[PDB]
Structure formats: structure tokens, C-alpha cells
Design a protein around this ligand. Structure first.
Ligand SMILES: [Pt+2]
Ligand SMILES: [Pt+2]
Length: 240
């Protein structure tokens, strides 16, 4: 049974839902507040989500539904994070392991800002996450994992062909990567399947710096245009 989307209120831990785009069966583990930067101070609520039969989602992407059976798979993770069927709006309540995992994630999610920008009817959404070491062997180097979502609001078909990353670090050294496709594939965005979301890692020295980029898109009429990636930062340990 599909519920209605909440217009003023977060989703309780344990709500079953489908993703607004590429609808997969997921369950929210806990929400976290993020800062939006729509280039086109404002906060926004995102959710840690455990997916099945196939991540961080937004509030507007959650399409909730209720069920009876233990629908979500990955039972080796739900038996550890959640408790069995009970009596509450979400019938899965959170176990103490999920509360400890939430307390462990809360500091690292503070270094995560969501950035958006719409260029020629192409909306890109980038959000970095931190996984690193204060000291890598021989020399201190830590990395990040940035999630990027491409969306085509226009009805015109278009395909991503080239990427043009430009990574600047704290030391003053800046890297520039012009590559073919994204994750070794060139996604197409049309009326059917208009969105594509991926994630990749970026290693860096000095444990600071910002990253901007450019995605090259091609239309069936031969025209190629560059969409901008909103410059997102890569910070560590309580600093903005
Ligand atoms: Pt990572
Ligand atoms: Pt992601």
C-alpha cells in the first residue's frame, strides 16, 4: 500500500519506499541534515538508505509504501540494524547496532554538502563523502567518494560523452582529468530513463581542496554542449 509523501516531516527509521527515479525497494535507516547549494543558508533532510535486489537519498525522492512481510532482502543487514516486526508506524524498529552506526556516521556526514546546478536543461547533483586516513604510509594522503546524479528535464535525448575533472588541492597542486565517458560508460538521457546516478573515488594530499568539472553531452543533431559541475569541497575534521 503506497502512502502519500510527507510534506512537512522526516521519515521514521524503518519506512519502506521506492526511489522517485529508478524505483528500487529501499528502507530508511536514519536521516541526516545536509546543506543544499542550488546554483540555479538553506538546509535539507537526506536519508541513509539500505537498498535491496540491485546509498544516500533525498526526501523528495522517497515514495513511501507499507507492507506486511519481511519484504526487504539483505536480511544479514536488517537483522543487525533493525528489529523484527512490531507495533509502530515504521513495523520495523531500530536495534542498538543501528544507533551505534548512526553515532559513528554523524561526525563524517558533517563534511558532506549537496551541490546542484542546471545547465541547458541538464541538472547535476554532486555530494562528497569522506573515507580516509590522517596518515597514509610514507606520506599523508586521504581520499573521498563523490556521488553524482545526472537528470534530463528536457524531452530532447542526449548522451554523456566526455568528462573534464579539475581537482585543486590545498598544497597548490591541481590535477586535470579529461576522460571518455563516466565509470567506463556513456549514459543516455531521454524521455525514458532520464536520470543516471554514479559514484567514484578521488584521492588527495594535504587533506583539503575543492573539485569542479565539466561533462560533455552530445545531441542526435550533432551538437555538443558542456554542462557545469558545481564546485564542491573536500574537507576533514571540523572545518568549513
Ligand atoms: Pt571510499
Ligand atoms: Pt551515491
Amino acid at each position: 500500500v503506497f502512502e502519500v509523501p510527507k510534506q512537512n516531516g522526516k521519515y521514521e527509521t524503518g519506512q519502506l519506499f521506492l526511489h522517485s527515479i529508478f524505483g528500487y525497494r529501499g528502507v530508511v535507516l536514519f536521516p541526516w541534515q545536509a546543506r543544499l547549494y542550488d546554483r540555479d543558508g538553506k538546509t535539507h533532510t537526506y536519508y541513509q538508505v539500505l537498498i535491496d535486489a540491485r546509498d544516500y537519498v533525498s526526501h523528495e525522492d522517497i515514495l513511501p509504501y507499507t507492507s506486511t512481510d519481511q519484504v526487504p532482502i539483505q536480511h544479514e543487514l536488517f537483522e543487525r540494524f533493525l528489529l523484527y516486526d512490531q507495533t509502530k508506524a515504521p513495523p520495523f524498529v531500530a536495534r542498538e547496532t543501528l544507533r551505534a552506526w548512526q553515532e559513528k556516521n554523524h561526525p563524517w556526514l558533517e563534511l558532506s554538502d549537496v551541490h546542484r546546478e542546471t545547465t541547458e536543461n541538464i541538472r547535476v547533483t554532486v555530494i562528497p563523502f569522506y573515507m580516509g586516513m590522517r596518515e597514509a604510509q610514507n606520506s599523508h594522503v586521504y581520499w573521498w567518494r563523490y556521488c553524482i546524479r545526472l537528470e534530463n528535464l528536457d524531452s530532447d535525448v542526449v548522451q554523456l560523452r566526455e568528462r573534464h575533472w579539475r581537482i585543486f588541492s590545498l598544497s597548490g597542486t591541481l590535477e586535470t582529468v579529461r576522460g571518455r565517458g563516466v565509470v567506463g560508460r556513456e549514459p543516455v538521457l531521454s524521455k525514458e530513463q532520464p536520470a543516471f546516478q554514479y559514484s567514484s573515488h578521488v584521492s588527495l594530499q594535504a587533506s583539503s581542496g575543492h573539485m569542479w568539472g565539466t561533462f560533455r553531452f552530445e545531441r542526435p543533431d550533432g551538437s555538443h554542449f558542456d554542462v557545469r559541475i558545481p564546485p564542491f569541497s573536500l574537507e576533514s575534521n571540523k572545518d568549513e
